[PDB]
Amino acid sequence: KLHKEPATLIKAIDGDTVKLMYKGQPMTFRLLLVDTPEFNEKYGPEASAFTKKMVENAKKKEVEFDKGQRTDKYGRGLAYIYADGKMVNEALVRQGLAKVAYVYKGNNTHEQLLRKAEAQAKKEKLNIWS
Template identity: 50%
Template sequence: MKQTLQLTVWLIVTLFLLSACGTVSSNQSADSSHATTTSGTTDKVEVSLIRIVDGDTIKVNYNGQEETVRYLLIDTPETKAPNKCVQPYGKNASKRNEELVENGKLELEFDVGQRKDKYGRLLAYVYADGQSVQETLLKEGLARVAYVYPPNTRYLDSYEDAEASAIDAHKAVWQQDGYATDKGFTGCSLEKNDDVSSDVETEQSDESATNFANCTALRETYPEGVPSTHPAYQQKFDRDKDNYACE
């Protein structure tokens, strides 16, 4: 009788320990799964717009400081890059970007990877009144999916879907085969010379000098600084690499 009782107690204890181990193992498994699917945050931070730079870059007031924001995962045709022409649909993308970011509350969302690029620009997903600016530009054919550097790929799938819809509809940059490529956009706008020359003539009518020793001298003539398309622009004056000197 005594042996039977001891055996019964031993079986109960064994069953209890096995059950406890199974619970711990299950909890550990659940925690591990949770960790792999929720890394990073989708919290958004509100910022105020200072100005747009081009189709995929803006300047904002973030935490009390002026910061340049480069949009994650997209690329738009050039309008201000040094030593590059104005590309087709570049001005369209800049104008549409301006329309979007000036529309209501402006927010940034960061991914799990680095928050700044080698030029010191913030890398973020941008929202205007809750609407994804990147996704809108892609859907309208004014941008391509580009600069995909893991782990900053949270919305890559949805962006590629948006791009695919624009390709299927032959919108904007996708109207001409070979213009938008994996390495960027090819070709220059036919309007480039007329647009630039008219701007330059207007600006030079008041001041013929275009070479300045430093930003202090340049601001005496151009208080707000100059874009890269201006004859007074010098790359050494563009410390934040936003294609705008001495701003």
């Protein structure tokens, strides 16, 4: 309750940040509840590429704010991002390309969903968990 919103993509940045045109400012958005490696750390180039293609290839790009703060202290948007109905945040965790991270109580609606995904990635020893 939680609603999605069309997202306009300027460019993918790395595993867990993307640049959107949001009411027609260029704005970095940071993915809620996850942490990908930096572009120059192990699985960093893979996380970047996964997010990039996932959002680029989607006909329908959406942003969904949580119930709490919509920007962080750095002025980045904080959201879940969906590509043709699939959550990027979740897909990264499921593939072992992001850890569940930065879980704040104002903004934690999809926590249990991402922890389930993380547990599957862990069990499978996938990427980060290898």
